[PDB]
PDB file of C-alpha atoms and ligand atoms in Angstrom:
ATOM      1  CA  UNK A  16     -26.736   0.687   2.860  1.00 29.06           C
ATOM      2  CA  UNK A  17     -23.414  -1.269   3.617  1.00 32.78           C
ATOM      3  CA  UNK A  18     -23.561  -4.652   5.190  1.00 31.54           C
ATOM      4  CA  UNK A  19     -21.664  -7.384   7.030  1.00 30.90           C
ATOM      5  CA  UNK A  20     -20.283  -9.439   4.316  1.00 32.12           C
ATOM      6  CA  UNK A  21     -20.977 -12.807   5.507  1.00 31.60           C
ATOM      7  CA  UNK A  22     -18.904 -14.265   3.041  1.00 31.88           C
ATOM      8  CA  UNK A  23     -16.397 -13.732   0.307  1.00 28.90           C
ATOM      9  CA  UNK A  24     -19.066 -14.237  -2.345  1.00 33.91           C
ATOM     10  CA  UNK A  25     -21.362 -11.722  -0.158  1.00 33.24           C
ATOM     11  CA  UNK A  26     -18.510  -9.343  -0.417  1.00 34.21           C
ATOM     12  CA  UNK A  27     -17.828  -9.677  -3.939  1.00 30.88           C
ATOM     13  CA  UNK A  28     -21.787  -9.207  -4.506  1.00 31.25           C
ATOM     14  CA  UNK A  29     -22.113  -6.053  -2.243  1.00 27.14           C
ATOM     15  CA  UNK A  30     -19.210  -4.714  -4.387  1.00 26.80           C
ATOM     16  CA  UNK A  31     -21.141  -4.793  -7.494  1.00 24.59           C
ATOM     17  CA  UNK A  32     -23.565  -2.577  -5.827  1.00 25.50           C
ATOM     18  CA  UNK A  33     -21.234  -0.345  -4.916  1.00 24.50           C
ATOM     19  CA  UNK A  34     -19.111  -0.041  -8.093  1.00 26.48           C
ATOM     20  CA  UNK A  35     -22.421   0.320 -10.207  1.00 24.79           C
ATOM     21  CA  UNK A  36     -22.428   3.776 -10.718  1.00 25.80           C
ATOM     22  CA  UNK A  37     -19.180   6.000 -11.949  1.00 25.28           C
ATOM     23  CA  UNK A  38     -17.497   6.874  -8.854  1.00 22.42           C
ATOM     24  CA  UNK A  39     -16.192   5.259  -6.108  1.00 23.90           C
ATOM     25  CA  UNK A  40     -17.139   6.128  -2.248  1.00 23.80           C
ATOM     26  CA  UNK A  41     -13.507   4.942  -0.802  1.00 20.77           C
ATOM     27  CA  UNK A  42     -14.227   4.993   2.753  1.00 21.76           C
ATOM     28  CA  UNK A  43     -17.258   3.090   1.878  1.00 22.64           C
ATOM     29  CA  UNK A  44     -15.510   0.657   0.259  1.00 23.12           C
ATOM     30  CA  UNK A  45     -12.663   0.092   2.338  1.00 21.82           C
ATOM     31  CA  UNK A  46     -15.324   0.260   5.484  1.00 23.94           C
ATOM     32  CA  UNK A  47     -16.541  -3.347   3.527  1.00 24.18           C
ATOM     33  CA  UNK A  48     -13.638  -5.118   2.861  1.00 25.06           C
ATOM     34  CA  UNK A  49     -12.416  -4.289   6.694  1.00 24.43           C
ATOM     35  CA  UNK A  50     -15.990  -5.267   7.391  1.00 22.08           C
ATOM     36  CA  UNK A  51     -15.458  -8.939   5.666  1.00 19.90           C
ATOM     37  CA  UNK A  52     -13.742 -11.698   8.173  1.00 18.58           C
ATOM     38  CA  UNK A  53     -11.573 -13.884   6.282  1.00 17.46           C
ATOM     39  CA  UNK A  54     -12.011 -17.549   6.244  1.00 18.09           C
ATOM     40  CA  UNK A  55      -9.436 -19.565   4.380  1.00 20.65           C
ATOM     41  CA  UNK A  56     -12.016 -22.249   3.135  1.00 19.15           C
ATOM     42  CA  UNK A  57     -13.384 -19.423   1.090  1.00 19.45           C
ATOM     43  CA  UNK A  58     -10.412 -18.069  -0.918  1.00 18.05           C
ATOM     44  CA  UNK A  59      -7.824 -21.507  -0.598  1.00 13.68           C
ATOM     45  CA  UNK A  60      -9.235 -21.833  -4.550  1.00 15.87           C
ATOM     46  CA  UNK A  61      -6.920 -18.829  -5.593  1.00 16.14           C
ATOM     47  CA  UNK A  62      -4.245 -18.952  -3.164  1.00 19.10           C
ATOM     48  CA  UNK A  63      -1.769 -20.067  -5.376  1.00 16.23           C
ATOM     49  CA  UNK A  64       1.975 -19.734  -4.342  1.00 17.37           C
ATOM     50  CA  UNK A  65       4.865 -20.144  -6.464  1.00 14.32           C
ATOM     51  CA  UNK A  66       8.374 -20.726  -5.374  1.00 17.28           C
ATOM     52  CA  UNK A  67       9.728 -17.501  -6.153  1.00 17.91           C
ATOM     53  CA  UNK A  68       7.811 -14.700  -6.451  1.00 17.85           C
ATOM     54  CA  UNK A  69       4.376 -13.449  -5.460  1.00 17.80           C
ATOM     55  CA  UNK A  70       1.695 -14.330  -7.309  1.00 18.12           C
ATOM     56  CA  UNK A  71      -1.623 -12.738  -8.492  1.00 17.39           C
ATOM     57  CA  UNK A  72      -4.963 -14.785  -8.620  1.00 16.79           C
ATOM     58  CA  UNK A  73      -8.389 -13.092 -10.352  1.00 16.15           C
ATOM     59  CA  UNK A  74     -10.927 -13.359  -8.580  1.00 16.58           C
ATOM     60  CA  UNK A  75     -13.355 -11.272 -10.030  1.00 16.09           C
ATOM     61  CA  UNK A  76     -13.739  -8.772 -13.185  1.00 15.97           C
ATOM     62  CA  UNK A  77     -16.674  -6.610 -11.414  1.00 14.21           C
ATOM     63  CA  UNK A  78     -18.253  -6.194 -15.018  1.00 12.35           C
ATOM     64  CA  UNK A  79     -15.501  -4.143 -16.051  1.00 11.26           C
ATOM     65  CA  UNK A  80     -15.681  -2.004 -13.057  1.00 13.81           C
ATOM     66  CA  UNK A  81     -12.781  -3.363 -10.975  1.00 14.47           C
ATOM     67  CA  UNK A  82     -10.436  -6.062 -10.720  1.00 12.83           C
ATOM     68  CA  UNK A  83     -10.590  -8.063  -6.883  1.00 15.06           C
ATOM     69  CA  UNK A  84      -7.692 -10.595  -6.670  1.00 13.73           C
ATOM     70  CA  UNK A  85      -5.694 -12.788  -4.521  1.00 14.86           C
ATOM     71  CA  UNK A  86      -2.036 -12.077  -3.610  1.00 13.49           C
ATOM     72  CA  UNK A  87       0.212 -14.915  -2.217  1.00 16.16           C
ATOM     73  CA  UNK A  88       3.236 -14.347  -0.733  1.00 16.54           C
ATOM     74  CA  UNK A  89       6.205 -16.827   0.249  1.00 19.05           C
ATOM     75  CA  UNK A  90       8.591 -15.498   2.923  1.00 21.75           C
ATOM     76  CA  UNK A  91      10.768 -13.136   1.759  1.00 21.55           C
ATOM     77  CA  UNK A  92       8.474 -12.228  -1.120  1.00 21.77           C
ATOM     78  CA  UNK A  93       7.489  -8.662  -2.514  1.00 20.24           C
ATOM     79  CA  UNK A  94       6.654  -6.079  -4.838  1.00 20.62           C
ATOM     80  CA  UNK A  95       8.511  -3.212  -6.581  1.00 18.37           C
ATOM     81  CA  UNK A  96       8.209   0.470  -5.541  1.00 18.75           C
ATOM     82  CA  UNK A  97       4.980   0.390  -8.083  1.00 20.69           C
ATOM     83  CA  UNK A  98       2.337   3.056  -8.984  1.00 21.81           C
ATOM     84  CA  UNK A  99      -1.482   2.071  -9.686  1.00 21.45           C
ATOM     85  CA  UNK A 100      -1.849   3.610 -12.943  1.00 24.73           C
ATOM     86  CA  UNK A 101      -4.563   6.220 -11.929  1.00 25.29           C
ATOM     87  CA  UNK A 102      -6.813   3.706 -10.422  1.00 26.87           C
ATOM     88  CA  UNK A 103      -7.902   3.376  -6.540  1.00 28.73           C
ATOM     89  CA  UNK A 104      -6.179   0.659  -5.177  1.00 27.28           C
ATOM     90  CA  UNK A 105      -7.221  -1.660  -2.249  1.00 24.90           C
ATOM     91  CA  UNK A 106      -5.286  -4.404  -0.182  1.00 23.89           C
ATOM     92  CA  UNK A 107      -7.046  -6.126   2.855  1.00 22.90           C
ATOM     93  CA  UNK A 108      -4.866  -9.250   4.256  1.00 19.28           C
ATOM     94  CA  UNK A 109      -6.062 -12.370   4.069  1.00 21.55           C
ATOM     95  CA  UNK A 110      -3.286 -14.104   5.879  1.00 21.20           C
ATOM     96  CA  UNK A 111       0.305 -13.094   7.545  1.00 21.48           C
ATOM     97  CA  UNK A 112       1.114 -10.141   7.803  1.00 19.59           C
ATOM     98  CA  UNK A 113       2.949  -6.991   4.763  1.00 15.97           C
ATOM     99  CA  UNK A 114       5.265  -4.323   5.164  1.00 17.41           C
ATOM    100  CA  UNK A 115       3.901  -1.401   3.250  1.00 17.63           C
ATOM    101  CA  UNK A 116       6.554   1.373   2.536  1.00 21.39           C
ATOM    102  CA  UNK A 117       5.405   4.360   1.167  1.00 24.64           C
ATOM    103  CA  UNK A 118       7.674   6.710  -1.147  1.00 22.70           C
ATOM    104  CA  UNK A 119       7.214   9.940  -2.393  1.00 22.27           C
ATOM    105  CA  UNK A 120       6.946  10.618  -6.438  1.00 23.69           C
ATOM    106  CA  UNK A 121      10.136  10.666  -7.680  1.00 22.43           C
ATOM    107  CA  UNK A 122      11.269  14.501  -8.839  1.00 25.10           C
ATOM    108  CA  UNK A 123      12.789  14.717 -12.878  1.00 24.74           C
ATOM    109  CA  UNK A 124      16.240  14.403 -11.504  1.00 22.66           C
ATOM    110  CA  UNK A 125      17.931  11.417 -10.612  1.00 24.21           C
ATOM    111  CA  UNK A 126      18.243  10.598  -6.391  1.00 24.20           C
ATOM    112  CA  UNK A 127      17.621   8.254  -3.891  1.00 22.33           C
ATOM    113  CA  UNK A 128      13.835   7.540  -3.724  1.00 21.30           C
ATOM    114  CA  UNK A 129      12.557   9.084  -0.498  1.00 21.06           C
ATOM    115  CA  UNK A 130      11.275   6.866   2.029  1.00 19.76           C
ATOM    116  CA  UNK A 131       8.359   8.376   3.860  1.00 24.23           C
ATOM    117  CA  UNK A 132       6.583   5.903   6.448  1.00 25.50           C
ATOM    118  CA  UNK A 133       6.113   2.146   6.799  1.00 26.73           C
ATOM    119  CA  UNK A 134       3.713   0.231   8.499  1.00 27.93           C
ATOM    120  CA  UNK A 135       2.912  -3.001   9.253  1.00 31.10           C
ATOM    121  CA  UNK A 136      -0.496  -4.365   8.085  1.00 31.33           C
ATOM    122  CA  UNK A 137      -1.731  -7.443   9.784  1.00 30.74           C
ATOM    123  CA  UNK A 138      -4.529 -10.151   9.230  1.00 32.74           C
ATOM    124  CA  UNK A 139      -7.346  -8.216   8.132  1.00 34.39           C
ATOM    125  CA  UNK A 140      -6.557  -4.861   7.898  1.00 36.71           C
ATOM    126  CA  UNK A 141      -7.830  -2.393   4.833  1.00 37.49           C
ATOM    127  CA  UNK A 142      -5.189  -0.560   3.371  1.00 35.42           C
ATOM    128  CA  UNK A 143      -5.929   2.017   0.528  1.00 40.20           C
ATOM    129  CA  UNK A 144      -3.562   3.520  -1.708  1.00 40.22           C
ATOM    130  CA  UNK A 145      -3.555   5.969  -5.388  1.00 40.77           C
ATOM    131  CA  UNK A 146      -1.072   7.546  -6.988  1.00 42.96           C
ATOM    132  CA  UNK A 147      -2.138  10.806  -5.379  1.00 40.64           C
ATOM    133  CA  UNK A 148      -1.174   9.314  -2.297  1.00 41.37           C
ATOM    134  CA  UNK A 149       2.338   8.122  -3.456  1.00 43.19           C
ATOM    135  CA  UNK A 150       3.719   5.187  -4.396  1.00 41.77           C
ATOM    136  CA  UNK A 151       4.686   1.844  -2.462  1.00 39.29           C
ATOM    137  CA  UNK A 152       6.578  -1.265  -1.815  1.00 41.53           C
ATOM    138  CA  UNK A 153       4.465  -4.112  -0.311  1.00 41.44           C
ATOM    139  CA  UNK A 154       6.504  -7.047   1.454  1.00 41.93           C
ATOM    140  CA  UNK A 155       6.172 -10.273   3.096  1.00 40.60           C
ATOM    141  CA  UNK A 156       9.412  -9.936   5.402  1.00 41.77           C
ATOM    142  CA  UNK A 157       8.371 -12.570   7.478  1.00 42.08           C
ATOM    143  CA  UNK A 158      10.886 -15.913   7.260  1.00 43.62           C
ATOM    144  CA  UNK A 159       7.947 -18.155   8.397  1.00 44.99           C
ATOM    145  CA  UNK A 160       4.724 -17.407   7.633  1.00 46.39           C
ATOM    146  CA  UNK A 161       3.402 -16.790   3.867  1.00 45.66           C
ATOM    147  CA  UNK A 162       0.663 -13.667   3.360  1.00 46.19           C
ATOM    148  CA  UNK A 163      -2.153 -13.704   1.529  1.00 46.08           C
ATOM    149  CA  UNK A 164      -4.003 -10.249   0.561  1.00 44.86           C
ATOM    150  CA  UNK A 165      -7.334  -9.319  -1.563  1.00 41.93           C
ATOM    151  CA  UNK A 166      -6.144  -6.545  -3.454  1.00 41.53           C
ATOM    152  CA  UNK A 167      -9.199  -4.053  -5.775  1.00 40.84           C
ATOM    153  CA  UNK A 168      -8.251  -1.739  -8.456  1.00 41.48           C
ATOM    154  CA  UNK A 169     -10.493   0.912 -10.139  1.00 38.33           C
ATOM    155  CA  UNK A 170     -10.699   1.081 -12.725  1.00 37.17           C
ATOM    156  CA  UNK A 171      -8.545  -2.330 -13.624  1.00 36.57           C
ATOM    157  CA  UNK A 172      -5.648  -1.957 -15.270  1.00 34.89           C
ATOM    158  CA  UNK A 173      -2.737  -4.340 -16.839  1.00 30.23           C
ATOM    159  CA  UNK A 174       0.559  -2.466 -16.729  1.00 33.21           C
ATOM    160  CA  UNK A 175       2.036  -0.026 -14.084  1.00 34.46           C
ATOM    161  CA  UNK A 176       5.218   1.515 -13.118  1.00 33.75           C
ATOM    162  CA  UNK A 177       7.894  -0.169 -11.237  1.00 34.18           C
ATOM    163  CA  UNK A 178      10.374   2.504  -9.833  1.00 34.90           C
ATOM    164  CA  UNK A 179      14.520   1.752  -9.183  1.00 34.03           C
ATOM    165  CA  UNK A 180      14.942   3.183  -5.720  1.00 34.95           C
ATOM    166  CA  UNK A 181      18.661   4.428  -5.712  1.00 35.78           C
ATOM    167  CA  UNK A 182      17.134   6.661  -9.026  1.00 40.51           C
ATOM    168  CA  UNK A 183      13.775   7.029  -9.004  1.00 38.42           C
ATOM    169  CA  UNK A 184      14.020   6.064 -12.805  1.00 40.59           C
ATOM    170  CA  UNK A 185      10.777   4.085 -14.033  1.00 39.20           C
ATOM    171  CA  UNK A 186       9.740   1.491 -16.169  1.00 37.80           C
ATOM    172  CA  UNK A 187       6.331  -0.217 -17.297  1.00 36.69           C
ATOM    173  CA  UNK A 188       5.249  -2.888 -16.479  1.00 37.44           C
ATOM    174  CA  UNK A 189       2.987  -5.280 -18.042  1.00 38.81           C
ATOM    175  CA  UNK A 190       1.189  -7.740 -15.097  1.00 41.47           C
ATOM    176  CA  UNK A 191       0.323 -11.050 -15.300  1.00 38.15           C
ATOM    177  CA  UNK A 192      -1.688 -13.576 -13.459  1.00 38.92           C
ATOM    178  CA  UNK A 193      -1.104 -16.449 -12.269  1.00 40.41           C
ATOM    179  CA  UNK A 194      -4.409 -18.063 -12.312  1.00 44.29           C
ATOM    180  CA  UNK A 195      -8.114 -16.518 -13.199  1.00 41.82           C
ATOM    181  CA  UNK A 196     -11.381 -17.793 -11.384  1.00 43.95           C
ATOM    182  CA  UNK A 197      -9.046 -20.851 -10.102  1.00 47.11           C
ATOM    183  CA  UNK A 198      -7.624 -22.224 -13.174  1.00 47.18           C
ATOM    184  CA  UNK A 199      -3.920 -21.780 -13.463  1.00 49.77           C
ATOM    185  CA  UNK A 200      -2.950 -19.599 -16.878  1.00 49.12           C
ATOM    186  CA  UNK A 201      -1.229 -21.324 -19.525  1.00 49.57           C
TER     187      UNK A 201
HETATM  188 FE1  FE2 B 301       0.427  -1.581  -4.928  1.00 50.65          FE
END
C-alpha cells in the first residue's frame, strides 16, 4: 500500500518496506519519491556544497538494499556521461532545477557519443534511469541558482563508468562522498 510521505524520514521508512524483498517495483518507487514534497528544513543536514564540484551526501544505507543520497550542485556544476553499474537508479530534485542528457551506449569503435534527448527536470520531479535505458549527463546549467537532488541506487554500488564524449572510450570510476549521515568524511 503506498503512502504520502509526510516527511523525508517517512519516505526513507516507506522505502524499507518497499526494498524488503528482492526486486524492485520501479513505478512504485518512483510513484513515492514524486509523492514526497520537499522541505529544505528536512534535508539542509546533507546539503553540503563545495566550491567546485558536485557533491554526494549519504543519507541512508537501506540495510544494504539501496543507497538514498543528497546531490548538491553549484552553478555550472555536473556529472560525466556515467553508467549505474547495473543498478536502478533514481533522482528526484530537491532544489533548482538539472539538465539530464541522455546518450546512447557507445558501439566498440571509436565516434562521437550520440546525443539522444534532453530534458529539463525541475523542483520535484522523479527521474529514473538504468543502464538498459542508456547512459546520462546530469547538469546544473543554471548561473544562479544551486540544485539539490535525492538520488537511489539498487543495488548500491561504489564505482561506475564515466564515458569521453568525442570517443565513447570509458573509464571506472571509484565514487566518493562527501559526507555520510551529516558528518563530513575525513
Ligand atoms: Fe546518473
Amino acid at each position: 500500500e503506498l503512502l504520502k510521505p509526510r516527511t523525508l524520514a517517512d519516505l526513507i521508512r516507506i522505502l524499507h518496506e518497499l526494498f524488503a524483498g528482492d526486486e524492485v517495483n520501479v513505478e512504485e518507487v518512483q510513484a513515492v519519491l514524486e509523492a514526497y514534497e520537499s522541505n529544505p528544513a528536512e534535508w539542509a543536514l546533507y546539503a553540503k556544497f563545495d566550491q567546485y564540484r558536485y557533491t554526494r551526501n549519504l543519507v541512508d544505507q537501506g540495510n544494504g538494499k539501496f543507497n538514498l543520497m543528497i546531490l548538491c550542485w553549484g552553478e555550472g556544476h555536473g556529472s560525466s556521461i556515467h553508467d549505474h553499474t547495473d543498478s536502478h537508479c533514481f533522482l528526484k530534485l530537491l532544489q533548482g532545477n538539472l539538465k539530464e542528457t541522455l546518450f546512447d551506449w557507445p558501439d566498440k569503435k571509436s565516434n562521437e557519443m550520440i546525443k539522444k534527448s534532453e530534458r529539463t527536470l525541475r523542483e520535484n520531479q522523479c527521474a529514473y534511469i538504468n543502464d538498459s535505458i542508456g547512459l546520462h549527463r546530469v547538469e546544473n546549467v543554471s548561473h544562479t541558482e544551486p540544485a539539490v537532488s535525492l538520488h537511489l541506487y539498487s543495488p548500491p554500488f561504489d564505482t561506475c563508468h564515466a564515458f569521453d564524449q568525442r570517443t565513447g572510450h570509458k573509464n571506472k570510476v571509484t565514487m566518493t562522498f562527501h559526507s555520510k549521515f551529516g558528518i563530513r568524511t575525513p
